[PDB]
Write a protein that holds these residues in place. Structure first.
Motif, PDB file in Angstrom:
ATOM      1  N   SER A 234      -3.442 -20.817 -40.034  1.00 28.11           N
ATOM      2  CA  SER A 234      -3.810 -20.640 -38.630  1.00 28.11           C
ATOM      3  C   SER A 234      -4.983 -21.561 -38.320  1.00 28.11           C
ATOM      4  O   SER A 234      -4.913 -22.376 -37.405  1.00 28.11           O
ATOM      5  N   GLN A 287       5.384 -17.754 -36.292  1.00 27.30           N
ATOM      6  CA  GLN A 287       4.441 -16.757 -36.769  1.00 27.30           C
ATOM      7  C   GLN A 287       5.232 -15.596 -37.338  1.00 27.30           C
ATOM      8  O   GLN A 287       5.984 -14.941 -36.626  1.00 27.30           O
ATOM      9  N   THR A 298       1.478 -18.118 -40.635  1.00 31.35           N
ATOM     10  CA  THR A 298       1.687 -19.115 -39.606  1.00 31.35           C
ATOM     11  C   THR A 298       2.288 -20.374 -40.212  1.00 31.35           C
ATOM     12  O   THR A 298       1.790 -20.905 -41.207  1.00 31.35           O
TER      13      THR A 298
END
Length: 343
Positions: A234, A287, A298
């Protein structure tokens, strides 16, 4: 006048002819979805493992492929892509994409499916590594298919030159062996090799020939997993290669050659969610919410196309593993009848 919607879908359900020509002509409605096309074709062949089949759209003049999600509309997809390239440059193919753990043992109880998978992998093998594998493997696989195609023929029928003659001259050995092997070996020597190699499998029935083919092919050709170059993270983005398949669920390759490191099993996937690109860029973000893990996994792909093909794969596996017919993909935070009119 409003033309009728007709679609050609290639598949691997054996017919009387060449593998690459097997296809079903489908007449469908304006609200027909990918799911209905898949179900109609597999139901027509009495398939049990319907959750393993997917529909792949290939561009003939390039390498870009698009896996079509079960919920998309057939007319919609054809509309969208015919804008990119003319209908003649597109190929719709029914394929097995989601494999259950111990798929071979499971497929043996679904003959139609076992044969399908066999034809699919055979065709991929013939096109991707048949000419690269070593003589021995190629020779055994070719013989196994001979044994399988002629399940009525006697074990030593190949011993007769007259019989071998028919396959060599009328049928053509290209139907079972790669070009390299047929052009790098002496005709008379090739014959003896084939005759000898066949003896080892003369006792095998259709099923046992298919299973042996996979046993022999498995070691040099991975047909039980898809790989994608992407990036996990992320905040910090780390590019890796993902290996998705029944054996190791969702995992990544540390380095070429080394065993894949497990990240999560299919049954732990709870939700799949798309994302585009908050900037000029066009990368696609996936995701995955995994049970037991507070932070979602992610994934970033080189393009939206790849992202969608990955989502389709994970969703297919989520459906398969959970026995659910509905999709695990969530929103970002009569008239659909189909009939086979020819083969």
């Amino acid at each position: 006048g409003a033309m009728e919607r007709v679609l050609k879908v290639f598949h691997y359900f054996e017919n009387s002819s060449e593998p690459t020509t097997w296809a079903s002509i489908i007449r469908h409605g304006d609200a027909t979805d990918v799911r209905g096309i898949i179900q109609k074709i597999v139901d027509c062949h009495k398939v049990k493992n319907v959750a393993c089949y997917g529909l792949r759209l290939s561009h003939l003049q390039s390498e870009e492929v698009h896996w079509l999600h079960l919920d998309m509309g057939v007319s919609n997809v054809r509309e969208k892509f015919e804008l990119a390239h003319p209908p003649e440059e597109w190929k719709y193919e029914l394929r097995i994409r989601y494999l259950p753990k111990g798929f071979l043992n499971q497929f043996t109880e679904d003959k139609p499916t076992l044969n399908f998978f066999y034809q699919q992998v055979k065709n991929d093998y013939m096109l991707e590594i048949a000419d690269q594998v070593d003589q021995e493997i190629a020779l055994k696989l070719g013989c196994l298919e001979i044994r399988r195609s002629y399940g009525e023929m006697r074990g030593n029928a190949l011993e007769k030159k007259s019989n071998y003659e028919v396959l060599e001259k009328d049928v053509g050995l290209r139907r079972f062996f790669p070009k390299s092997l047929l052009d790098s070996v002496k005709a008379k020597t090739l014959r003896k090799l084939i005759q000898q190699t066949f003896r080892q499998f003369a006792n095998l029935n259709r099923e046992e020939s298919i299973l042996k083919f996979f046993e022999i092919l498995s070691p040099v050709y991975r047909f039980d997993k898809e790989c994608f170059k992407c990036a996990l993270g992320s905040s910090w983005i780390i590019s890796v290669e993902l290996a998705i398949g029944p054996e190791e669920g969702i995992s990544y390759l540390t380095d070429k050659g080394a065993n894949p490191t497990h990240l999560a099993d299919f049954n732990q996937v709870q939700t799949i969610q798309y994302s585009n690109s908050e900037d000029k860029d066009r990368k696609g973000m996936l995701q995955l919410k995994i049970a037991g893990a507070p932070e979602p996994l992610t994934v970033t792909a080189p393009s939206l196309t790849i992202a969608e093909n990955m989502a389709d794969l994970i969703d297919g596996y989520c459906r398969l593993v959970n026995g659910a017919t509905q999709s695990f993909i969530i929103r970002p935070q009569t008239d659909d009848y189909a009939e086979i009119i020819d083969e």
